[PDB]
Amino acid sequence: ASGGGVPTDEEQATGLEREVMLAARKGQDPYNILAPKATSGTKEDPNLVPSITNKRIVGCICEEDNSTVIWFWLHKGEAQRCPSCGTHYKLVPHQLAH
Template structure:
């Protein structure tokens, strides 16, 4: 009986000495609060958020600015080449689309309604 007691005591002491004192794992909520989108975003989302901070819209996520369509304030058409095919709905309830080629340079008019369009070179985000 004394041998069993001695054996149990030795094994308990040996188990206690093998345990390494580690700090408790803390979650983000207990240290600094819940992480923001900027802190946990990765990949394309992170690239878009960094662009928004600098006032850019790298993937054309935001709604484009409204233009009058006049010669002084033409509709902006982004393009990666020198020309682009553009479709114009000349009237609000029109079912036919007027298609025409828009070339780089000055603003050009729609052949049907006279609304002005301008081709602007656009860089790809990646």
């Protein structure tokens, strides 16, 4: 009929491949494979930007089908606003290990 003998990914994937696979299954994206879903971006409900360090570049697509992304460094601290459209972004920690 058939028989087996071929390892699966659960058995034999290692390294970064294995981590991405394990994370995927807990619904997490530590290695930024998916696009984040925006919040409403107000002062009360800002977009939460994971970073491992104290700052991270945000590109903001202010309206759908804009051909030009607005780029800016986002720093740890107060929520900052897109220079172009004002939508709020606050930096956070969790992309981190122990």
